[PDB]
Amino acid sequence: STSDLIPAPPLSKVPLQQNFQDNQFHGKWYQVGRAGNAALPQKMTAQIYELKEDKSYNVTAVRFRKKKCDYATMTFVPGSQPGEFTLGNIKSYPGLTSYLVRVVSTNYNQHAMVFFKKVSQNREYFSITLLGRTKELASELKENFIRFSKSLGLPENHIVFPVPIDQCIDG
């Protein structure tokens, strides 16, 4: 019925990891950081990336909800340039007309920063996630995650750091 979101930033303000290596990005990643213009404590979730033969990703989200492990699998389709992706079978997602994925930065074996933008029910949402190969990351990376977010118009109260857990995501 109604909603008010912080304008999505122009893509030019969103870097792209150069010479992106899709194979090395495969595997599990913990969501240590999450920022978004989305609606206003969160337990940590994980995202497993698997490179299919056709080089598109099978991404599985895993979270601990209501005492159970809830799984969700999406399909990331290589976009206009390496490190960028689009959502597969988008028509199976009610009211979703656009979905963009752009790997901002990553050393592949420790951390990554991913930028997400989508159009759902005509409302434009965007978000940045700080992923770590481990549930914990150096403060310096978190600080850089925080600065990046803010540089995109997002206030601190829109930047949360999920609390690490053991259930479902392995501990």
- The HSE-up count of residue 136 (CA atoms within 13 Å, CB side) is 4
Domain regions of the chain by residue span: 1-171
Residue 102's nearest CA partner among 121, 127, 125, 124 is 127
d(CA 127, CA 155): 12
d(CA 84, CA 98): 14
* Strand 123-132 versus strand 159-160 pairing type: unpaired
Give the H or E element holding residue 1.
none
**Resolution, rounded to a tenth of an Å?**
2.5
Please state, as a whole number, how many other Cβ atoms lie within 10 Å of the Cβ of residue 58: 14
Sequence-ordered list of residues with C-beta below 8 angstroms from that of 76, at least 6 positions apart, any chain: 49, 56, 57, 59, 85, 86, 87, 88, 101
CATH assignment of 1-171?
2.40.128.20
**Experimental method, per PDB record:** X-ray
The answer to whether the beta carbons of residues 37 and 119 sit under 8 Å apart is no
Residue 31's nearest CA partner among 127, 118, 153, 147 is 127
The answer to whether the beta carbons of residues 73 and 59 sit under 8 Å apart is yes
